[PDB]
Amino acid sequence: CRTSCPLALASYYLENGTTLSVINQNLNSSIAPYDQINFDPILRYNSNIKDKDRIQMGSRVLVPFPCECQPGDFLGHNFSYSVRQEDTYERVAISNYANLTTMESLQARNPFPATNIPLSATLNVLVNCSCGDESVSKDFGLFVTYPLRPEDSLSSIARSSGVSADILQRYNPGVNFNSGNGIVYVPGRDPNGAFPPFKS
Ligand SMILES: *[C@@H]1O[C@H](CO)[C@@H](O[C@@H]2O[C@H](CO)[C@@H](O[C@@H]3O[C@H](CO[C@@H]4O[C@H](CO)[C@@H](O)[C@H](O)[C@@H]4O)[C@@H](O)[C@H](O[C@H]4O[C@H](CO)[C@@H](O)[C@H](O)[C@@H]4O)[C@@H]3O)[C@H](O)[C@H]2NC(C)=O)[C@H](O)[C@H]1NC(C)=O
Ligand SMILES: CC(=O)N[C@@H]1[C@@H](O)[C@H](O[C@@H]2O[C@H](CO)[C@@H](O[C@@H]3O[C@H](CO)[C@@H](O[C@@H]4O[C@H](CO)[C@@H](O)[C@H](O)[C@H]4NC(C)=O)[C@H](O)[C@H]3NC(C)=O)[C@H](O)[C@H]2NC(C)=O)[C@@H](CO)O[C@H]1O
Ligand SMILES: *[C@@H]1O[C@H](CO)[C@@H](O[C@@H]2O[C@H](CO)[C@@H](O)[C@H](O)[C@H]2NC(C)=O)[C@H](O)[C@H]1NC(C)=O
Numbered sequence: 001c002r003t004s005c006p007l008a009l010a011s012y013y014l015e016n017g018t019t020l021s022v023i024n025q026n027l028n029s030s031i032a033p034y035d036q037i038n039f040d041p042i043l044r045y046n047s048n049i050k051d052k053d054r055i056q057m058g059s060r061v062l063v064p065f066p067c068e069c070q071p072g073d074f075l076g077h078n079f080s081y082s083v084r085q086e087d088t089y090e091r092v093a094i095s096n097y098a099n100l101t102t103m104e105s106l107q108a109r110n111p112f113p114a115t116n117i118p119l120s121a122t123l124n125v126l127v128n129c130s131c132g133d134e135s136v137s138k139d140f141g142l143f144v145t146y147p148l149r150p151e152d153s154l155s156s157i158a159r160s161s162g163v164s165a166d167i168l169q170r171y172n173p174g175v176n177f178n179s180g181n182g183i184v185y186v187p188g189r190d191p192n193g194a195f196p197p198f199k200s
């Protein structure tokens with residue numbers, strides 16, 4: 001890959017009861033190790049969360065994760081997911097991983113037929129990321145993998161992210177931010193609120 005970076009952030013939208021523990025379990029990694037006790041690696045990136053044990057539906061939780069060159073020369077990370085009763089590839093993508101992955105991607109990279117994913121199977125779950133693009137800007141080197149929802153628009157994301165609309169669009173060329181689906185990459189902040197710069 002032409003770029004590299006020490007981490008990316010995943011934007012996980014909260015609905016139907018999701019808890020911080022489930023997020024940390026599903027998105028467990030070396031960068032956010034799940035031990036059920038210490039959620040600091042996640043909470044550092046979400047200073048808005050008042051109570052880690054009662055999180056608020058309708059908000060998004062930012063989760064740090066490793067961003068690695070994948071075969072095929074693109075950036076992403078393989079999470080691991082332990083299958084539970086009634087899980088399906090569709091549900092795992094749209095609910096368990098909050099559209100950070102797709103059902104097609106899960107089906108392609110796991111060997112279980114859709115109608116018989118065994119209990120306690122592990123799935124390999126790919127979530128893509130970005131380390132930035134020097135030709136767009138030197139100012140950003142940390143990116144949020146952001147699944148779009150019907151309520152988002154380019155102006156609404158520019159407003160909340162603190163990044164100009166033109167810059168967001170250039171990082172995501174040709175992509176309609178009002179389309180209500182798919183992902184865009186949005187520059188993100190360190191735990192102290194600063195944007196880490198691009199690093200070649
Ligand atoms: C994320 O998780 C996925 C799935 O587990 C991993 O995918 C595996 O990646 C490895 C490479 O690191 C794959 O092994 C390599 O297979 C090569 C053959 O592949 C082409 O694949 C395309 C489609 O993807 C096909 O169309 C072609 O027909 C080919 O098959 C093979 O050439 C290669 O050989 C070499 O490298 C190894 C070292 O890894 C040497 O030991 C060896 O001598 C040789 O030079 C590999 O065997 C593997 O097949 C993938 N597994 C699956 C299930 O797809 C990613 O690697 C994970 N990401 C990270 C960062 O680890
Ligand atoms: C892409 C996509 O998401 N497609 C959806 C389909 O996946 C979905 O079909 C349902 O898929 C699930 C997941 O594979 C499937 O559930 C599995 O069912 C088998 C039984 O057939 C279970 O295996 C048994 O478990 C018991 C223990 O509980 C064992 O005692 C027994 O030996 C096992 N049987 C066999 C033969 O191995 C799996 O445990 C179970 N997996 C999970 C994770 O629950 C459903 O059966 C599928 N249902 C149908 C109707 O095919 C489909 C649902 O409509 O929707 C698609 O969109
Ligand atoms: C979360 O994911 C990490 C990274 O894959 C897992 O890391 C392993 O942890 C054990 C025990 O500490 C080590 O011996 C292994 O070497 C680690 N593996 C790797 C590849 O780094 C960790 O186990 C995961 N946690 C859970 C609960 O699954």
Ligand SMILES: *[C@@H]1O[C@H](CO)[C@@H](O[C@@H]2O[C@H](CO)[C@@H](O)[C@H](O)[C@H]2NC(C)=O)[C@H](O)[C@H]1NC(C)=O
Binds near residue numbers: 015098099149
């Ligand atoms: C992931 O995207 C899916 C598809 O848009 C979302 O599910 C849809 O949600 C709408 C309301 O937002 C429902 O009317 C549809 O029935 C849902 N479609 C499907 C396929 O179930 C889903 O909410 C998104 N996940 C998250 C966590 O935001």
Ligand SMILES: *[C@@H]1O[C@H](CO)[C@@H](O[C@@H]2O[C@H](CO)[C@@H](O)[C@H](O)[C@H]2NC(C)=O)[C@H](O)[C@H]1NC(C)=O
Binds near residue numbers: 072074101102126
């Ligand atoms: C992560 O990015 C890769 C590379 O763009 C995507 O892989 C492409 O996916 C499409 C649609 O399924 C396939 O037609 C291509 O064959 C894939 N290309 C390569 C190089 O593998 C992948 O879909 C993205 N992953 C997710 C979960 O969005």
